[PDB]
Design a binder for this molecule. Structure first.
Ligand SMILES: OC[C@H]1O[C@@H](O)[C@H](O)[C@@H](O)[C@H]1O
Ligand code: NA
Length: 601
């Protein structure tokens, strides 16, 4: 029915006993009682500040809230004791409550020394409070010696927010809390901690990932576990993985470019946690996070109705500052959102009608073309809503001076719809990749997708590296072929891990896959570091890749994060070469996120 958003603080900084409140946690009890947990920070810092774990209770479904009670009390007189980064987990089968948090002594996450004795003051401990009675009374234990089977795992902390219980498959019942660890080589890794015995005993799964951090899991309509992680390598995105063995082990980790993230915690839940395995409702996920690649702001809810493959629906809940957010499914059928507005801990409620979407994701393929050209690309709407909509329309958001229109057949339940998008790119459009937004506008909700229209660039897929002067592959992935992989988040980086690596000049040559009329090169700097930016440069081209004609163009790049063009009289060529002559502030290394070649396909 009617859209609903509502919002109210639970904690403000310098009020009710602490000068700082952070790190939100939120669950629903087998009663329907809502529990909000969070850091009370005397000295305003994460571990090892002598922090407390706090909690409040709503016995009327999120309208009103009881006293600010202490679950875990920090010791601020020496020996100091810190308890921080809270995360709930309900076992709805026994109905027991867990609340995981760190127990820190002298050392934070950074300086945690290997070992697992509770008494050791240089270990950051894994703690879990236990409550068998709805979260009123609490028992306390230290589980580090159970979840460190690799001795070089020198550090750990449970991902703040809320954890899961598997409802399906051979592992049904299993409780799963996510951790981040530090291994011997000091890489940040993701790992599930689980219990097959309702909390009695806990163990660690197989560590997966590099550049990981605070991360969450959700069980999909088929019982697979989706991991969704914070990227500590600062990609601008969420990292993702999947387990087919109930959180023991995950497959390859990828950057999820559907999911821009500023290096912040995020949350991912089942919208319908009790639905049968395999059902339409069992594929529904809500995702909350800072929807900006660069700042903790524009908090955004996304809805997936296809196990998180596609994310058709999104809506901003907070324009301004928004750090950690966590979601929880309410018994009333609405949703709890506990986030960080900046003044402490806020509690928000929304319903699915607020989100304002239609479960009907659509695909419109990427298209390549020269300027002057007209092209029809099809639309395929996968109507997952199961409802009739007489007259849907397609709004497109393309460049100001393009000729664009969208169209979509009537929307029918259970069956797909067809649509079309015609595009004319006028003569004189700047060569580039154009991200065009498409919106499906309908009576019962909107869905939207993006697709790229490449204008006068050559196909990267046909390209290869012909030569590179220098590349780092030992201590990080700085392969030259990264300039032609599509991903501004992966880069070429000249060797750095050895001291005798060359400085400038640097060189990278592309083989174009064939001979093409070419007229320019677009350079994209490395996005997450500023000391390997190319300044002075020359460009060369070749037909046979050994006789080089040039410099055909020359100049100096800016510190602009966007693609920058270097243009030259059109000419046939099978190869193009970039010579980086200098760095922006004089440094040894070059990094390049992307090279595109302006030319005729
Ligand atoms: O030695 C310089 C290196 O510094 C590292 O910290 C960085 O991750 C590398 O990309 C490289 O720039
Ligand atoms: Na790249």
């Amino acid at each position: 029915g009617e859209p609903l958003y509502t919002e109210q603080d639970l904690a403000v900084n310098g009020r009710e006993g602490f000068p700082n409140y952070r790190i939100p946690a939120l669950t629903v009890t087998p009663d329907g009682d809502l529990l909000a947990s969070y850091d009370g920070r005397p000295t305003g810092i994460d571990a090892p500040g002598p922090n407390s774990i706090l909690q409040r209770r709503s016995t009327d479904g999120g309208r009103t809230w009881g006293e600010q009670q202490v679950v875990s009390a920090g010791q601020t007189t020496a020996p100091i004791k810190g308890f921080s980064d809270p995360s709930y987990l309900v076992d709805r089968e026994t109905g027991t409550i867990f609340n995981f948090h760190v127990y820190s002594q002298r050392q934070g996450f950074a300086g945690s020394r290997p070992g697992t004795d509770p008494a050791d003051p240089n270990v950051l401990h894994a703690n879990v409070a236990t409550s068998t009675d709805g979260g009123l009374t609490w028992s306390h234990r230290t589980i580090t010696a159970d979840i460190t089977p690799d001795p070089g795992w020198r550090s750990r902390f449970a991902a703040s927010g809320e954890g899961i219980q598997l409802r399906y498959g051979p592992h049904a019942g299993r409780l799963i809390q996510q951790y981040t660890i530090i291994n011997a080589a000091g890489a940040f890794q993701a790992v599930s901690v689980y219990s097959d015995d309702h909390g009695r005993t806990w163990r660690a799964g197989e560590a997966v990932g590099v550049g990981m951090d605070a991360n969450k899991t959700v069980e999909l309509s088929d019982g697979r576990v989706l991991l969704n992680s914070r990227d500590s390598a600062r990609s601008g995105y969420r990292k993702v993985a999947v387990s087919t063995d109930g959180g023991h082990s995950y497959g390859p980790v990828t950057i999820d470019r559907d999911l821009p993230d500023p290096t912040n915690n995020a949350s991912i839940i089942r919208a319908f946690p009790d639905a049968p395995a395999g059902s339409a409702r069992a594929k529904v996920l809500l995702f909350s996070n800072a929807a900006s690649q660069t700042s903790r702001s524009q908090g955004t809810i996304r809805m997936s109705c296809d196990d998180g493959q596609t994310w058709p629906v999104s809506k901003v809940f907070q324009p301004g500052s928004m750090s950690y957010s966590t979601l929880t499914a309410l018994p009333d059928g609405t949703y709890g959102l506990l986030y960080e507005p900046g003044t402490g801990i806020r509690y928000a409620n929304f319903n699915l009608a607020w989100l304002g979407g239609i479960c009907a994701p659509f695909t419109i393929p990427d298209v390549a073309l020269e300027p002057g050209q007209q092209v029809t690309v099809p639309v395929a709407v996968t109507n997952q809503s199961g409802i009739a909509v007489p007259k849907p329309s397609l709004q497109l958001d393309a460049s100001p001076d393009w000729q664009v229109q969208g169209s979509v057949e009537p929307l029918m339940p259970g069956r797909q719809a067809k649509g079309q998008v015609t595009i004319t790119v006028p003569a004189g459009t700047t060569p580039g990749r154009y991200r065009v937004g498409a919106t499906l506008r309908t009576s019962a909700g909107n869905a939207s997708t993006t697709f790229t229209v490449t204008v006068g660039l050559l196909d990267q897929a046909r390209m290869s590296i012909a030569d590179v002067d220098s590349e780092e592959t030992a201590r990080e992935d700085g392969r030259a072929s990264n300039v032609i992989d599509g991903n501004p988040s992966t880069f070429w980086h000249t060797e750095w891990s050895r001291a005798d690596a060359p400085g400038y000049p640097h060189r990278i040559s592309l083989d174009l896959g064939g001979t093409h009329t070419i007229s320019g090169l677009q350079y994209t700097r490395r996005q997450n570091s500023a000391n390997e930016q190319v300044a002075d440069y020359e460009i060369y081209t070749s037909l046979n890749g050994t006789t080089w004609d040039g410099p055909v163009a020359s100049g100096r790049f800016t510190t602009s994060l966007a693609p920058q063009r270097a243009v030259f009289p059109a000419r046939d060529a099978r190869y193009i070469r970039l010579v980086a002559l200098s760095e922006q502030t004089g440094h040894k290394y070059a990094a390049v996120a992307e090279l595109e070649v302006e030319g005729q396909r």
